[PDB]
Amino acid sequence: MNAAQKLGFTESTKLLIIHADDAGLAHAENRATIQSLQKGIVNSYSIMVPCPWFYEMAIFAKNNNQYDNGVHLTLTCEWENYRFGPVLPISEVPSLVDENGYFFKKRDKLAQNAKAEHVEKELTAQIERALKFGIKPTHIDSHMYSVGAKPEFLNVYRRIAKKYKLPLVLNQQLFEMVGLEMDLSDFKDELLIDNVFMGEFKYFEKGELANFYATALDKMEGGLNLILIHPAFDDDEMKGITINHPNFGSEWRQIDFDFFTSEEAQSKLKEQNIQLITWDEIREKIYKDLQAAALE
Amino acid sequence: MNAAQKLGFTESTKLLIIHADDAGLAHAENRATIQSLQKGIVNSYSIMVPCPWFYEMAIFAKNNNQYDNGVHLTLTCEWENYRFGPVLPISEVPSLVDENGYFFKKRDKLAQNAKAEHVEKELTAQIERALKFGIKPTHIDSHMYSVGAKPEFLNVYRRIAKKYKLPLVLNQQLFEMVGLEMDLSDFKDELLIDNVFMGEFKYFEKGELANFYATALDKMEGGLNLILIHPAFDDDEMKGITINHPNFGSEWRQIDFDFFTSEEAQSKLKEQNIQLITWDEIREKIYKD
Ligand SMILES: [Mn+2]
Ligand SMILES: [Mn+2]
């Protein structure tokens, strides 16, 4: 059984979430995310609480409930010159940060250094800060999927998701990405994404990233599908953030914004009978199914 | 005696520091500040440690000490959507922040709320963090001159400068601007700048801020003169930061950059016989072996 049936649809249904990550990271990213939601076919996004432009994104989110919004849990900071650290004070979560008090650049260093207790504390703090700013999140997911850097970290993530009664991103391709060879019979109580799509260097370098997105739309199969993008204007701010980091860098994010606000993308959606769904709808369906099961 | 005399110069000598504030505020401001030092006549600057682009500026400062660099002490955050707070944990300095954990927008809210012990801890922590990053500051000054919001805050500021054996920005006009009516007789142990120049909105709104800087250089007289500017490229980042805040806004900051990298401004230094000086030279005259 694939996730589309577990949500009430036929097997053949091409469920899709087009999800913008890293909202709150930069002003250019906030503006491109908002525009892709307003006009594009992007239909969900998640927010990086520890980030310098989180506040602006929060003001947008608390007053624009119609757009499916979640918390982009952040434990790593990958950029050369633009560095951020935890919501909580360094002294409370010392194993999460480098000598400058910023998150590590790599999941490897994080998994080698971080204590599961510090991870639970800081992730809970990020969600609590979002809630106190008036955000009503519909899901939680993970920047660079650092929650998979250790099995204990993923268990903390699952436990936090159940505590807040929120859906979360769990998927087998993302598991293999982070080397987390966890079994599949542990996830009986969870909804697993059948297919996660994201851009790759090998297509970007050959000028074919837009082509990859087009083909991905063209050949989407039945089940729950998730497209992860990072729309942002390729301006001075993003060039400064992504210096020496072409992978998911500023030109890449520009390509994301262009393709997923393009009439080509909408035409491919309608051509293929791909049905968009939000995390909010998924949470409502799971809530009603559990309410119905518990009484009966 | 003006400050040039106390520094060993004749009375008529025109000492000038051309000083970029708000470094570390933004990437556009970091880049305009660096370029105005390397290719313009700017010769000093100071860094906002709490700000989100502090690290980029710190890397530059630690590797390029030939440019006079100080700590722009920060206790207020004036911008609408770009918010920041203290280096220290909120529980340590709770009186310094609004309900979101950020600095208040105006000096007078700071004066209403802040305890001086919290101000002392937070300013000390900004200097200490700069030092940990390998910055070798030559002076300290104050964002929005909020050290002047209360006399006891200014006393903290003076004590901190003496503790680090660094000079600081003190000046009678700055005192008046922030409503501080201190009598000068308590500053015998201090070096006061004779004249502080900064842009004014009434010239900016005529399009004549550049002309204002030209007159400032033309009319400069003997003593210690400080020009305060905020060079930054007027790009999308700065428009996003300075939204609804045209006073020292993004267009204004671009004008700062363009004037102080121009042939006009350099020629004016020569024509007026203006002698540039840094805070480090002053520091070496005051604090001896
Ligand atoms: Mn991310
Ligand atoms: Mn300032």
- Number of folded domains that form chain A: 1
DSSP string, B57-116: HHHHHHH-TTSEEEEEE------SS-----SS-TTTSGGGB-TTSSB-SSHHHHHHH--H
Among the listed residues A235, A231, A263, the one whose alpha carbon sits nearest the alpha carbon of residue A248? A231
Residues of B with CB under 8 A from a CB of A: 27-28, 31, 52-53, 55-56, 59, 81-84, 89, 91, 100, 102, 133, 233, 235-237, 240-241
Cβ distance A133 to B237 less than 8 Å, yes or no, reads no
Produce one character per residue of A116-136: b if its CB has 16 or more CB atoms within 10 Å, e if not.
eebbbbbbbbbbebbeebebe
| CB within 8 Å of B69: residues ≥ 6 apart | B23, B44, B45, B46, B47, B61, B135, B136, B137, B138
The owner of tokens 């996003």 is B240
Contacts of A52 in chain B (CB under 8 A): 52, 82, 84
Structure tokens that stand for A15 in this block: 């469920």
Indicate the residue of A31, A82, A236 with minimum beta-carbon distance to B235.
Answer: A236
Cβ distance A236 to B83 less than 8 Å, yes or no, reads no
Distance CA A222, CA A49 (A): 34
Q: Is B143 annotated as ligand-binding?
A: yes
Domain hosting A89: range is 3-295
Q: Exposed, middle or buried: residue A217 (CB in 10 Å: 0-12, 13-18, 19+)?
A: buried
3-state secondary structure chain A: CCHHHHCCCCCCCEEEEEEEEEECCCHHHHHHHHHHHHCCCCCEEEECCCCCCHHHHHHHHHCCCCCEEEEEECCCCCCCCCCCCCCCCHHHCHHHECCCCCECCCHHHHHHHCCHHHHHHHHHHHHHHHHHCCCCCCCEEEHHHHHHCCHHHHHHHHHHHHHCCCCECCEHHHHHHCCCCCCCHHHCCCCCECEEECCCHHHHHCCCHHHHHHHHHHCCCCEEEEEEECCCCCCHHHHHHCCCCCCCCHHHHHHHHHHHCCHHHHHHHHHHCCEECCHHHHHHHHHHHHHHHHHC
Contacts of B81 in chain A (CB under 8 A): 55-56, 59
Judge contact between B44 and B68, C-beta under 8 A. Answer: yes
State which residue of chain B sits closest to A237, comparing Cα positions.
B237
Kindly give the distance from the C-alpha atom of residue A72 to the centroid of ligand 1, in angstroms, as a whole number. 7
Kindly give the distance from the C-alpha atom of residue B50 to the centroid of ligand 2, in angstroms, as a whole number. 12
Three-state DSSP state, B264:
helix
Distance CA B276, CA B273 (A): 10
Distance CA A115, CA B67 (A): 42
Kindly give the distance from the C-alpha atom of residue B107 to the centroid of ligand 2, in angstroms, as a whole number. 12
Amino acid at B237: E
Distance (Å) from the alpha carbon of A280 to chain B's nearest alpha carbon? 27
Q: What Å distances lie between residue A83 and A7, A99, B104, CA to CA?
A: 40, 12, 24
Longest dimension (CA), chain B: 54
Among the listed residues B289, B285, B288, B279, the one whose alpha carbon sits nearest the alpha carbon of residue B71? B279
Distance (Å) from the alpha carbon of B83 to chain A's nearest alpha carbon? 7
Produce one character per residue of B200-230: b if its CB has 16 or more CB atoms within 10 Å, e if not.
eeeebeeeebbebbbebbeebebbbbbbbbb
Judge contact between B12 and B211, C-beta under 8 A. Answer: no
Distance CA A194, CA A223 (A): 6
How was this one solved? X-ray
What is the total residue count of chain B?
A: 289
Structure tokens that stand for B117 in this block: 């012990």
Rounded to an integer, what is the distance from CA A26 to the centroid of its chain?
Answer: 16
Q: What is the CATH number of the domain that holds A47?
A: 3.20.20.370
Residue B267 CB neighbour total at 10 angstroms: 11
Q: Is B139 annotated as ligand-binding?
A: no
Residue A155 CB neighbour total at 10 angstroms: 15
Indicate the residue of B27, B55, B89 with minimum beta-carbon distance to A83.
Answer: B55
Distance CA A90, CA A107 (A): 19
Distance CA B200, CA B256 (A): 12
Structure tokens that stand for B276 in this block: 């540039």
Distance CA A186, CA A209 (A): 35
Judge contact between B85 and B97, C-beta under 8 A. Answer: yes
Residues of A with CB under 8 A from a CB of B: 27-28, 31, 52-53, 55-56, 59, 81-84, 89, 91, 100, 102, 133, 233, 235-237, 240-241
3-state secondary structure B205-231: CCCCHHHHHHHHHHCCCCEEEEEEECC
Among the listed residues B194, B182, B125, the one whose alpha carbon sits nearest the alpha carbon of residue B155? B182
- Angle, helix B116-132 to helix B151-163, in steps of 10 degrees: 30
When scoring A35, A56, A98, A99 by the number of chain B Cβ atoms within 10 A, the one with the most, hence best to mutate, is A56
Distance (Å) from the alpha carbon of B20 to chain A's nearest alpha carbon? 20
| CB within 8 Å of B112: residues ≥ 6 apart | none
Provide Rg for chain A, Cα atoms. 18
Residue A176 CB neighbour total at 10 angstroms: 12
Amino acid at A45: Y
Amino acid at B284: E
Among the listed residues B255, B256, B261, B250, the one whose alpha carbon sits nearest the alpha carbon of residue B26? B250
Distance CA B207, CA B73 (A): 31
Distance CA A93, CA B47 (A): 27
User: CA geometry: angle at A170 spanning A168 and A174, to 5°?
Assistant: 130
What is the total residue count of chain A?
A: 296
Q: What Å distances lie between residue A99 and A87, A96, A104, A217, CA to CA?
A: 16, 10, 10, 44
Distance CA B128, CA B218 (A): 39
Q: Report residue B22: phi and psi, to 5°.
A: 65, 20
State which residue of chain B sits closest to A24, comparing Cα positions.
B82
When scoring A53, A90, A131 by the number of chain B Cβ atoms within 10 A, the one with the most, hence best to mutate, is A53
Distance CA A277, CA A227 (A): 12
Judge contact between B110 and B104, C-beta under 8 A. Answer: yes
Which residues lie across from B68 on neighbouring strands?
A: B44
Distance CA A247, CA A34 (A): 23
Resolution in A: 2.3
Q: What Å distances lie between residue A150 and A168, A178, A239, A275, CA to CA?
A: 17, 9, 32, 34
Q: Exposed, middle or buried: residue A6 (CB in 10 Å: 0-12, 13-18, 19+)?
A: middle
Cβ distance A236 to B28 less than 8 Å, yes or no, reads yes
